[PDB]
Amino acid sequence: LGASWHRPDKCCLGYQKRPLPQVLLSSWYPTSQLCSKPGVIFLTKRGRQVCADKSKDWVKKLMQQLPVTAR
């Protein structure tokens, strides 16, 4: 059975390379502390998720524009 093995929490080494508008975004949740280079994954209203590092520019604005999502 080859579905998808190996997956500790999440860890998103890769990030996005394009700025999205908050007009359709919702919030953002932080990664775990067990990854090589963990940043933050966003979660649009009905779109999809996006691995983005706060170090970016457009991601920084969103971080302040949106509160957070974690439960």
Side-chain angles (χ1 to χ4, degrees), residues 7-52:
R7 50 142 273 195
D9 214 315
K10 255 141 199 184
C11 301
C12 209
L13 53 92
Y15 293 94
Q16 215 179 228
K17 274 210 269 272
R18 53 175 151 288
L20 337 190
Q22 197 263 322
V23 62
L24 80 319
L25 214 52
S26 288
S27 335
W28 52 276
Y29 76 98
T31 27
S32 215
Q33 269 150 286
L34 316 314
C35 313
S36 190
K37 55 209 215 216
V40 188
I41 286 80
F42 286 63
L43 325 157
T44 61
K45 303 154 75 208
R46 190 156 188 286
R48 266 175 53 197
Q49 276 96 292
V50 177
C51 297

